[PDB]
Amino acid sequence: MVETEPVQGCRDFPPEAMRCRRHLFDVFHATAKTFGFEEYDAPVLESEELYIRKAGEEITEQMFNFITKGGHRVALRPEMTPSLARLLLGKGRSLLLPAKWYSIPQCWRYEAITRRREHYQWNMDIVGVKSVSAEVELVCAACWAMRSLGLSSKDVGIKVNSRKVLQTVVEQAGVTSDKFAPVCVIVDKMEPREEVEAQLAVLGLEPTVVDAITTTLSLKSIDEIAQRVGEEHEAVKELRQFFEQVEAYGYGDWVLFDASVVRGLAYYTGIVFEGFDREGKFRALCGGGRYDNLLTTYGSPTPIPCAGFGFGDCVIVELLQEKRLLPDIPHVVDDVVIPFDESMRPHALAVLRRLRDAGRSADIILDKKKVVQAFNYADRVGAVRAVLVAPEEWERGEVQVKMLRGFAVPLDRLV
Amino acid sequence: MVETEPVQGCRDFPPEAMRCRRHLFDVFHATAKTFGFEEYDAPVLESEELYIRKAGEEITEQMFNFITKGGHRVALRPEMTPSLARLLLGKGRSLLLPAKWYSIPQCWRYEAITRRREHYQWNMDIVGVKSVSAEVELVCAACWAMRSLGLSSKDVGIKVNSRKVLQTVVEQAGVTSDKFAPVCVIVDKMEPREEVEAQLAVLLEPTVVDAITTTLSLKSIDEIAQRVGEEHEAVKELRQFFEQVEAYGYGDWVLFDASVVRGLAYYTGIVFEGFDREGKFRALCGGGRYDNLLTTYGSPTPIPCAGFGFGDCVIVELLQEKRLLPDIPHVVDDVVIPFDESMRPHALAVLRRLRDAGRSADIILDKKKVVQAFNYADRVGAVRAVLVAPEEWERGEVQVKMLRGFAVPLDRLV
Numbered sequence: 125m126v127e128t129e130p131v132q133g134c135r136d137f138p139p140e141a142m143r144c145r146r147h148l149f150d151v152f153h154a155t156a157k158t159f160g161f162e163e164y165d166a167p168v169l170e171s172e173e174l175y176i177r178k179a180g181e182e183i184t185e186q187m188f189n190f191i192t193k194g195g196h197r198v199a200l201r202p203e204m205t206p207s208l209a210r211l212l213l214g215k216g217r218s219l220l221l222p223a224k225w226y227s228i229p230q231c232w233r234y235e236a237i238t239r240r241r242e243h244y245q246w247n248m249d250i251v252g253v254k255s256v257s258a259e260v261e262l263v264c265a266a267c268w269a270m271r272s273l274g275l276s277s278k279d280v281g282i283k284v285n286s287r288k289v290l291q292t293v294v295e296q297a298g299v300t301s302d303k304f305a306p307v308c309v310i311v312d313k314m315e316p317r318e319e320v321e322a323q324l325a326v327l328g329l330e331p332t333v334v335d336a337i338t339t340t341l342s343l344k345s346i347d348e349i350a351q352r353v354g355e356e357h358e359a360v361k362e363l364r365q366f367f368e369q370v371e372a373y374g375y376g377d378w379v380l381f382d383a384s385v386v387r388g389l390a391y392y393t394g395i396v397f398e399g400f401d402r403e404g405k406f407r408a409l410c411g412g413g414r415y416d417n418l419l420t421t422y423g424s425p426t427p428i429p430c431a432g433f434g435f436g437d438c439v440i441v442e443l444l445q446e447k448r449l450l451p452d453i454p455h456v457v458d459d460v461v462i463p464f465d466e467s468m469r470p471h472a473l474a475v476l477r478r479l480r481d482a483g484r485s486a487d488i489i490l491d492k493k494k495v496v497q498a499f500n501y502a503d504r505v506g507a508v509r510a511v512l513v514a515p516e517e518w519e520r521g522e523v524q525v526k527m528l529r530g531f532a533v534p535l536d537r538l539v
Numbered sequence: 540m541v542e543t544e545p546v547q548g549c550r551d552f553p554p555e556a557m558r559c560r561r562h563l564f565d566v567f568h569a570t571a572k573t574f575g576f577e578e579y580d581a582p583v584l585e586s587e588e589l590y591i592r593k594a595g596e597e598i599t600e601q602m603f604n605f606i607t608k609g610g611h612r613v614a615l616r617p618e619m620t621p622s623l624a625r626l627l628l629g630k631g632r633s634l635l636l637p638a639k640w641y642s643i644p645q646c647w648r649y650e651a652i653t654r655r656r657e658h659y660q661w662n663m664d665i666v667g668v669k670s671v672s673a674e675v676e677l678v679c680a681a682c683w684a685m686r687s688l689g690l691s692s693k694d695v696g697i698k699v700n701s702r703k704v705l706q707t708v709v710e711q712a713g714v715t716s717d718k719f720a721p722v723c724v725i726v727d728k729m730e731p732r733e734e735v736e737a738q739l740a741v742l743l744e745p746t747v748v749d750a751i752t753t754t755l756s757l758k759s760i761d762e763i764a765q766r767v768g769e770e771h772e773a774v775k776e777l778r779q780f781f782e783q784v785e786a787y788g789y790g791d792w793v794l795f796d797a798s799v800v801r802g803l804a805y806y807t808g809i810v811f812e813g814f815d816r817e818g819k820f821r822a823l824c825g826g827g828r829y830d831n832l833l834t835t836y837g838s839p840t841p842i843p844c845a846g847f848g849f850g851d852c853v854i855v856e857l858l859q860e861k862r863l864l865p866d867i868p869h870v871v872d873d874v875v876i877p878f879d880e881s882m883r884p885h886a887l888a889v890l891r892r893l894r895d896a897g898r899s900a901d902i903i904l905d906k907k908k909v910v911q912a913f914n915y916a917d918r919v920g921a922v923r924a925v926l927v928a929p930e931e932w933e934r935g936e937v938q939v940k941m942l943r944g945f946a947v948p949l950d951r952l953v
């Protein structure tokens with residue numbers, strides 16, 4: 125017998141599981157459409173050179189990579205943002221801005237544990253908008269998706285911060301700019317306190333510079349940030365604008381400030397955010413931020429402002445299961461056409477044709493079955509209606525219909 | 540600068556191209572739903588052992604395979620049917636039959652060219668149905684999809700045959716059953732006549748080759764009946780098939796062709812493939828019955844299956860030729876325009892309302908003068924522009940313009 129289990133760390137989606145995934149994706153698509161984002165896609169296979177950022181990111185550390193027969197370094201994408209940037213850079217001058225693009229790529233990782241190696245990740249990005257209205261819209265989109273799935277602001281929130289605060293603190297200490305990305309990557313690991321301080325020292329930062337970083341991540345309000353860097357610091361004005369705009373849109377209860385949020389990606393320059401459950405039970409539900417320099421690093425002759433997020437398919441489902449918002453969605457079909465016997469099969473097919481022409485989902489019983497077994501089958505597939513095509517009714521230009529006693533119905537009136 | 544081109548043989552789908560792909564997939568999904576099939580999926584990465592069939596298939600010859608860091612032989616799936624079989628075999632007794640399952644996997648191949656290495660392929664399969672009604676439904680589904688895209692029976696058809704005819708001819712000649720799959724794979728190659736005869740010899744004497752050649756050239760079912768009898772399984776089944784398609788109303792879409800075998804080892808019965816009537820393109824779709832596959836995978840009981848694959852590349856070329864793929868421009872219901880930044884908070888409340896009512900809506904995100912905001916609305920294909928200006932706002936109103944303006948109460952926007 126062949127191996128029935130899927131490849132290590134990968135999921136199968138038989139129909140039952142697929143209906144769940146589809147319920148989730150319906151919301152991602154519908155939210156994107158509500159917010160005016162355009163779908164795109166790109167190959168799961170990208171050049172490895174695309175992901176070499178040299179900041180010690182977990183995402184680059186766990187690349188699912190391999191060498192082609194031709195000898196080229198490729199990888200199954202660990203994330204989508206670089207692919208997006210490649211596409212944007214390809215279009216160059218011909219891309220109309222602003223652009224709002226989304227996708228739901230499967231993304232990949234390798235880990236030596238004998239644990240998940242793939243997930244699907246909703247990506248939403250806004251390109252060509254300098255102002256915080258982008259981040260506002262993005263955070264609202266994430267909340268909208270969660271609310272659409274049945275969650276409330278009692279269940280979840282979005283923690284919001286700006287990396288510009290830390291930038292200034294690190295830059296005031298005399299640390300070269302190139303160290304800033306590594307610092308964010310290290311400080312993201314705070315969620316072992318001694319080991320984080322140790323890694324920062326290896327980066328070449330003295331104890332007092334580490335102290336200033338620690339203190340600023342522990343400041344619990346925007347006013348406290350204001351005391352440290354000033355009320356007219358870019359981060360303060362922008363964070364204030366952000367919260368004012370989310371409040372105006374009606375999602376104020378969903379969002380809050382948290383100075384410890386930095387995210388683990390090298391490329392965020394400004395506002396960063398992540399979704400979380402209010403019970404403190406799960407990892408991040410989604411994550412994102414502004415990354416205004418990425419396209420410049422890729423060689424764009426002009427700077428292109430970008431912001432966006434990723435929203436995974438695994439943590440959200442666990443949360444929905446906990447909150448009892450993922451009831452089993454059973455299969456449905458409008459009609460099941462039942463030939464009384466094989467001599468009625470041709471007539472039954474004409475009926476089936478009609479039903480499908482009118483936009484109805486319909487089965488016909490394919491093998492030889494007795495009527496009552498055909499009826500049981502109809503119930504198993506969740507048919508709303510059984511349509512028995514029997515010789516007596518057929519001579520009267522009729523069929524028998526039963527909603528799941530029967531009724532005789534003219535053919536013309538079935539649809 | 541980084542490489543902007545995608546990896547060799549792979550396609551990018553920026554929004555314009557993605558809208559085309561989505562138009563196609565909408566039809567695949569909608570056809571599956573119309574026909575009562577259930578969606579499934581499985582990993583693009585499968586074990587290589589899953590595809591080692593040893594019949595010289597093109598599909599096994601061109602596997603995109605590699606070795607993990609852990610040392611396991613894996614591959615990006617060249618097709619979906621083995622993955623389907625794996626899932627079916629996993630469920631075993633607990634799967635309710637009949638089952639009708641579909642998916643739209645990306646599938647992969649490696650070729651030493653300078654040419655496509657990936658395509659998307661609609662798969663539709665019926666599991667647990669012994670009778671030709673399965674193949675009927677499958678062929679009708681394919682036609683339905685093509686008709687849904689704007690094609691007619693003047694544009695395309697489905698050639699249909701049964702491998703059982705050839706089975707009998709080969710088996711009458713004394714050829715061991717294990718040679719039958721290789722014979723089909725070879726005979727599928729009929730488009731170089733001398734080289735096909737040569738490959739069969741490496742496998743069968745000249746007179747056995749002669750009988751194979753003649754039977755592929757027979758132009759009707761009655762002619763098949765003369766050779767193997769009207770009681771031969773292939774004859775009865777093909778007759779039933781055409782009778783059922785006729786009854787469903789797709790008789791003009793289908794026809795008999797004794798040269799159709801397909802290139803896959805596993806087909807046991809009816810096989811079919813879609814084609815354009817102008818003879819310009821490769822096969823549009825292909826499939827057949829494969830009643831032994833699950834048995835080869837170790838199923839303790841035989842499980843009848845039939846299905847097809849329907850690629851995303853040839854169909855699009857055909858639709859482009861027939862001028863059935865007009866550019867689909869982006870659309871959005873509303874574009875909310877703040878008169879200036881002091882109106883942004885009010886504009887956001889309006890945006891919220893519009894979206895609450897099920898409308899697709901943008902708000903102008905950066906600082907723009909009104910006329911530039913309006914131009915932007917037109918570019919994104921907005922049906923309606925909603926200007927939120929201080930004067931109207933004090934009256935509990937906004938300005939609306941369908942793409943002169945009108946003042947409208949907030950309550951009446953939706």
Ligand SMILES: N[C@@H](Cc1c[nH]c[nH+]1)C(=O)O
Binds near residue numbers: 204
């Ligand atoms: N690529 C980020 C998410 C993101 C999308 N756009 C911006 N950020 C991640 O994987 O966490």
Ligand SMILES: N[C@@H](Cc1c[nH]c[nH+]1)C(=O)O
Binds near residue numbers: 662
């Ligand atoms: N796997 C086949 C198509 C198919 C699906 N089901 C049965 N046949 C192919 O790629 O040609």
Ligand SMILES: Nc1ccc(Br)nc1
Binds near residue numbers: 183203232241
């Ligand atoms: N980056 C990444 C990829 C795949 C999974 Br599962 N999680 C994270």
Ligand SMILES: Nc1ccc(Br)nc1
Binds near residue numbers: 598646648655
């Ligand atoms: N089997 C297969 C795979 C990929 C492409 Br492109 N064509 C055929």
